[PDB]
Design a protein around this ligand. Sequence first.
Ligand code: D12
Ligand code: D12
Ligand code: D12
Ligand code: D12
Ligand code: OCT
Ligand code: K
Ligand code: K
Ligand code: K
Ligand code: K
Ligand code: K
Lengths: 268, 282
Amino acid sequence: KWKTVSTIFLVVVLYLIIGATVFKALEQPQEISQRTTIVIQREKFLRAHPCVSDQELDELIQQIVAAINAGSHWDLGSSFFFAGTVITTIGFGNISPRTEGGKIFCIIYALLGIPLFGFLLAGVGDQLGTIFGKGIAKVEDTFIKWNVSQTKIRIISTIIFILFGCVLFVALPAVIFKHIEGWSALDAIYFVVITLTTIGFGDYVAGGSDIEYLDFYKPVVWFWILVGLAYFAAVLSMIGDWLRVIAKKTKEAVGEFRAHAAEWTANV
Amino acid sequence: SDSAINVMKWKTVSTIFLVVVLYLIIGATVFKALEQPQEISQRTTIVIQREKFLRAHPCVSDQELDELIQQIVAAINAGIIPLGASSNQVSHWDLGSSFFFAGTVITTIGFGNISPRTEGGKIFCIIYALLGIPLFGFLLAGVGDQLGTIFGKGIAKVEDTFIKWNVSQTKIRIISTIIFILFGCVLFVALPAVIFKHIEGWSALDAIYFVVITLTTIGFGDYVAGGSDIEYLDFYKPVVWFWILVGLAYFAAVLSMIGDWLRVIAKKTKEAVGEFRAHAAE
Ligand SMILES: CCCCCCCCCCCC
Ligand SMILES: CCCCCCCCCCCC
Ligand SMILES: CCCCCCCCCCCC
Ligand SMILES: CCCCCCCCCCCC
Ligand SMILES: CCCCCCCC
Ligand SMILES: [K+]
Ligand SMILES: [K+]
Ligand SMILES: [K+]
Ligand SMILES: [K+]
Ligand SMILES: [K+]
């Protein structure tokens, strides 16, 4: 009977409107500054090099505009890492197929590989899940007979998951990425989130911009991803549970308010 | 009992792990066979345009050309139009684009054609994702249940007119899943691809490629329905993410049906090797 999706639908729409207004408040200023200071860089180069004329720069730009479509790529290791992006639905896009066949293979490779990877992430999920269950069984005895109650220890135990988790799956890889690709502190944490949330903008990739890295690095990246995906999958599911709790709390909250509001009001 | 099953599970994981590794190696070799030819041709014919413009204009800084290209490469990472004319442009963070950017984030599509450059925009995106991604999941779940039981209406009337004599309900489940994919790929794949073909000017394969990459939430961003500037009625850009909302629910079922098919084929090829290695030509 009750739809109940309508209330969710409008929360998501409003959530997109808020984010939209926040992003164009955060980004359009530095969009202005970049684009205005590029015409300075161009008008600098029309003057500083009279060798190039007004039309001949435009010819060069459009060859780089055509170079956008392509840019060694697709080597023995890169195409291996490309396939990892597809089945995990990360899809950084820094490497994308250009052949008509490459597209069709990728379409078929995704429709069959994405379900395949799901079973691995599920097994790695169970594997990771019961390993942490061994760590908390030791912790759920030593200070659990002592004062604090088990209905409240559920709070202490979940803190240690996120604390110890963001160390291994977020902190350590970001520190490593900071000292290998030379990223900033935020770039590395931004990359970790964008990677393990499967958003994968591709603006930061541990394999692109490829001057220095060895064969001990590019395997550990995807291996980190495999296990890290399982971590956020739990995290992004715990956060969902928090939203389910808050949703029920605020559903009955309007319940009691609109209970007493119409209660006194109806009395004549 | 308690950890006897766990030994039986890491042996399951190890077998899956290697199937995925083999599957990645196969795809790898196929892609670098499909793509690296067209990489070689593009890489060699750009050094021709390189050396063409190295001689033809000697009085340009011969080595600072690369310095200019990289400044344009860095400018490519933003929404630029660096030309002599057309020095006014449109904003990629306008009222509508940032709305569509947020749709990419919570759906974990993330086309990346528009990405935040401010350190604040990054941190908001990080917080916007970790809270928005779970949020969207409930909408897609509700739209999933909503779509699911709407199709349950249409199949209920059809699964009665198809009740002739000697019909087997275990095999009518085969007929019913065909009409799901048939009508499914029409409304959620065929019709939007045909529309994208006539609006974005794409080819037939580009549009179907885009639909898959979008609704499989891979989202390379090499094709985006709202990346160029062509006309965009703005009855169009809302229907795009609205299509995505319901289309994601469709592949979510499809990519789950395919998973079940692989679970069946896994058991069949499990016992197929049992039959083979049990006998071995008697
Ligand atoms: C241009 C037409 C492309 C058709 C691709 C069909 C691929 C079917 C794959 C089925 C995977 C289960
Ligand atoms: C060294 C500076 C790193 C600061 C990273 C800030 C990220 C804020 C995340 C907010 C968590 C809810
Ligand atoms: C019935 C739907 C109401 C759910 C309201 C959820 C509000 C989430 C607040 C998150 C802000 C950080
Ligand atoms: C981003 C915070 C959104 C807050 C929306 C609150 C909506 C209240 C839901 C009431 C449901 C009965
Ligand atoms: C690409 C499918 C590999 C099949 C391996 C089967 C091993 C039992
Ligand atoms: K790019
Ligand atoms: K994804
Ligand atoms: K992506
Ligand atoms: K993605
Ligand atoms: K991308």
